[PDB]
Amino acid sequence: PHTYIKTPTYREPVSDYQVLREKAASQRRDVERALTRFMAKTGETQSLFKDDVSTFPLIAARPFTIPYLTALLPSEL
Amino acid sequence: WRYGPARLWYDMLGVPEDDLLADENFLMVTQLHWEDDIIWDGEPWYSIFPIDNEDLVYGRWEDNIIWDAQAMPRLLEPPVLTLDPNDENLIL
Amino acid sequence: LSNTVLPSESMKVVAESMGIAQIQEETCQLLTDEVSYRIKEIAQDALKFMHMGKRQKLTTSDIDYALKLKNVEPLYGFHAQEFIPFRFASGGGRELYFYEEKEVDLSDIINTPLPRVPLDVCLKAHWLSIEGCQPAIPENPPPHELSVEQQLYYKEITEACVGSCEAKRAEALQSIATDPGLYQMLPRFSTFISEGVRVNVVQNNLALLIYLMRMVKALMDNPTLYLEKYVHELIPAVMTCIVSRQLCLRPDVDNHWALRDFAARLVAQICKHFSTTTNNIQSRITKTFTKSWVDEKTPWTTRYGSIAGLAELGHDVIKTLILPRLQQEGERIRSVLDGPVLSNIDRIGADHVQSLLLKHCAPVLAKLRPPPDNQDAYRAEFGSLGPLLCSQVVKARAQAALQ
Amino acid sequence: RLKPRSIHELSVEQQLYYKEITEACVGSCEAKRAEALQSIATDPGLYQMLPRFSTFISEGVRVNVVQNNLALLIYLMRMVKALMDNPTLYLEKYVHELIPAVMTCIVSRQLCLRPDVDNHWALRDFAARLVAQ
């Protein structure tokens, strides 16, 4: 065969619903954890424990001037 | 693309539509010290890797770089993106 | 461009409404250059009632005032509220358009709802400008992508590296360097970086280029993401901050020099981690640096970038890629020790090139020479590289003593 | 913009040939190893497969000196010798992966049988010094 054989096959795709659910879930969890740690580190922060910024940082609660606009309104429409 | 990734650059620009050259020297053997290459029990993982990128092998991205700020064919332009995803793991 | 008239085949159709069976083509040309001449004389006299009576609309009472002006009998029935309807008739070979008029029972016009009574003309005064700008009274004019989570993460991370403050930038770069799931956002970061380095040509901002090179250096330190597929937009950006000539807005005071050695260290790392014999990254980077350095007419900034990358690549790339073109130092010292043209910028860049050259060629001279080095400087070009080599041998002896 | 998938630069047969030659060159049977070595030293189309052979050699010796497996090494050195005398292929774009392999086959700590394995490792030493020049 090596003398004269050229067979152009494709690439086996991933159809495993289990590992696709796991990949999408873990990527969403990791990007939302990275986003919330970045936003809690670069702003005012609270803490459930005394002087706890590295582990479980909370974004501090800021008051709105008009709170029904950020509560009731839909953001994806 | 204007509104896609790199929209920040597009907005900042304000565009709104929408001997030594001898090839032996560069032989990897004559550019690499082998003693350092060996781990030699002192304190990889590529070979059956699936595929390589066209640009990384043939594409001369160095040519795209302009070296003259006086004669610059590559200048203020939209350079719109074609938004074409691949690599792997990417949903579809 | 040309005199536009009604078509000559529109007069054969009109002549058969009359009863004229055969009309020759020279008669039809005689008809249509007269009726299109009288259309243009009522088109331009209707426009004199549209302009003198200030309207900019050309209502149908403008044409009726112009037909009254040319003595021709008026056209009855064009003041009612109508529009432009036409009805196509296909037929067995006769293609035409007509009106398709409709009817209405007479008692449904006697019993129509009457419109409201009009108002009489009155005057109203209001200030338009009061010694300056207009008041704000109501009579004036008024004056397959990314999910939202990672879209917001992309927005915050990219706008943290544009330069509002340094602490948010350091936390954003420590996010990019140390997060596990930033794939699916690597092509967006590569596009952002490559287009942002391109936008340096419109605005020669040194600071934003330093920020983008620290973004690339943070992207390289991430253990989880593999830049093998998305480095085709990173290597170019890195080398744009190396072999370009204007990296500064004010060339004399801006230290483009550091974005040079930082990006040179960056490209040495990008071709240490990713060069494979299928890639030929390092050989193709050395070839661009080499033909940019050996070729004359190149500015001292781009020669500085070429020498910086070649000397950051490795010792072989300063010994068998830089050392032999050492006679070029004489061509450099032609324009440094000697020349009335002193107040140009070709001196600071030349002695920066000189300092980088002798700093990188001092350990290469320490590797391939005798230990004495008595008059190696005299044997060297300009006798300075040799002094630097003696200093390098002294530094190596000091390092050995420390060990 | 969804796009098509790329293909590996080796044929489905060429890849099967590489798998058979590498599984024969680890020397389970002498006949297999010998025929495979002859094929490595004569194949004209063995270029464009040579990165994967050089990487298999280099990577092998480095994880094969973690435990000093002499046959695994003697077979890889014979594979290097069979790669070198092939006249068609262009080798000096890949010796950055070859010299280090022969180096550790000559200058490493080999603490196996004091006299018996010395004979065995001295045959690997002979192979290494010859292929080095």
UniProtKB/Swiss-Prot annotation, chain A:
Main location: nucleus
GO terms assigned for molecular function: protein heterodimerization activity; RNA polymerase II general transcription initiation factor activity
Keywords annotated in UniProt: Acetylation, Cytoplasm, Developmental protein, Differentiation, Intellectual disability, Nucleus, Phosphoprotein, Transcription, Transcription regulation
Induction of expression: Induced with triglyceride accumulation.
Entry's localization field: Nucleus; Cytoplasm
Any GO BP annotation: transcription initiation at RNA polymerase II promoter
Example of a GO cellular component annotation carried by this entry: perinuclear region of cytoplasm
Description of how the protein assembles with itself and partners: Component of the TFIID basal transcription factor complex, composed of TATA-box-binding protein TBP, and a number of TBP-associated factors (TAFs), including TAF1, TAF2, TAF3, TAF4, TAF5, TAF6, TAF7, TAF8, TAF9, TAF10, TAF11, TAF12 and TAF13. Interacts with TBP, TAF1, TAF6, TAF10, TAF11 and TAF13. Component also of a small TAF complex (SMAT) containing TAF8, TAF10 and SUPT7L. Forms a heterodimer with TAF10. Interaction with TAF10 is mediated mainly via its histone fold domain while interaction with SUPT7L is via its C-terminal region.
Domain remark text: Ectopic expression of the histone fold domain acts as a dominant-negative mutant resulting in differentiation inhibition.
Protein function: The TFIID basal transcription factor complex plays a major role in the initiation of RNA polymerase II (Pol II)-dependent transcription. TFIID recognizes and binds promoters with or without a TATA box via its subunit TBP, a TATA-box-binding protein, and promotes assembly of the pre-initiation complex (PIC). The TFIID complex consists of TBP and TBP-associated factors (TAFs), including TAF1, TAF2, TAF3, TAF4, TAF5, TAF6, TAF7, TAF8, TAF9, TAF10, TAF11, TAF12 and TAF13. The TFIID complex structure can be divided into 3 modules TFIID-A, TFIID-B, and TFIID-C.
Membership in a protein family: Belongs to the TAF8 family.
Gene: TAF8
UniProtKB/Swiss-Prot annotation, chain B:
Post-translational modification: Phosphorylated by casein kinase II in vitro.
Localisation per UniProt entry: Nucleus
Record-annotated membrane-spanning stretches: none
Superkingdom as given in the UniProt entry: Eukaryota
Family classification: Belongs to the TAF1 family.
Task of the protein: The TFIID basal transcription factor complex plays a major role in the initiation of RNA polymerase II (Pol II)-dependent transcription. TFIID recognizes and binds promoters with or without a TATA box via its subunit TBP, a TATA-box-binding protein, and promotes assembly of the pre-initiation complex (PIC). The TFIID complex consists of TBP and TBP-associated factors (TAFs), including TAF1, TAF2, TAF3, TAF4, TAF5, TAF6, TAF7, TAF8, TAF9, TAF10, TAF11, TAF12 and TAF13. TAF1 is the largest component and core scaffold of the TFIID complex, involved in nucleating complex assembly.
Quaternary data: Component of the TFIID basal transcription factor complex, composed of TATA-box-binding protein TBP, and a number of TBP-associated factors (TAFs), including TAF1, TAF2, TAF3, TAF4, TAF5, TAF6, TAF7, TAF8, TAF9, TAF10, TAF11, TAF12 and TAF13. Interacts with TAF7; the interaction is direct. TAF1, when part of the TFIID complex, interacts with C-terminus of TP53. (Microbial infection) Interacts with SV40 Large T antigen.
Comment field on protein domains: The Bromo domain mediates interaction with histones that have acetylated lysine residues at specific positions. The second domain also recognizes and binds histones that are butyrylated and crotonylated.
Name of the protein in its database record: Transcription initiation factor TFIID subunit 1
Range of the intact protein held here: 362 to 532 of 1893
UniProtKB/Swiss-Prot annotation, chain C:
Chain positions with Phosphoserine modification: 194
Subcellular location: Nucleus
Any one GO MF annotation of this record: RNA polymerase II general transcription initiation factor activity
Keyword annotations of the record: Apoptosis, Disease variant, Intellectual disability, Isopeptide bond, Methylation, Nucleus, Phosphoprotein, Transcription, Transcription regulation, Ubl conjugation
Top-level division of the source organism's lineage: Eukaryota
Outcome of substituting residue 38 to C: In ALYUS; decreased interaction with TAF1 and TBP shown by functional expression studies in a Drosophila cell line
GO cellular component: cytosol; MLL1 complex; nucleoplasm; nucleus; protein-containing complex; SAGA complex; SLIK (SAGA-like) complex; transcription factor TFIID complex
Any one Gene Ontology BP term: regulation of DNA repair
Main location: nucleus
Similarity comment: Belongs to the TAF6 family.
Subunit (UniProt): Component of the TFIID basal transcription factor complex, composed of TATA-box-binding protein TBP, and a number of TBP-associated factors (TAFs), including TAF1, TAF2, TAF3, TAF4, TAF5, TAF6, TAF7, TAF8, TAF9, TAF10, TAF11, TAF12 and TAF13. Interacts directly with TBP, TAF1/TAFII250, TAF9/TAFII31 and TAF12/TAFII20. The TAF6/TAFII70-TAF9/TAFII31 heterodimer forms an octamer complex with the TAF4B/TFII105-TAF12/TFIID20 heterodimer.
Disease: Alazami-Yuan syndrome: An autosomal recessive syndrome reminiscent of Cornelia de Lange syndrome and characterized by delayed psychomotor development with intellectual disability, hypotonia, microcephaly, short stature, poor speech, and dysmorphic features.
Listed name of the protein: Transcription initiation factor TFIID subunit 6
UniProt organism field: Homo sapiens
Part of the intact protein present: 9 to 473 of 677
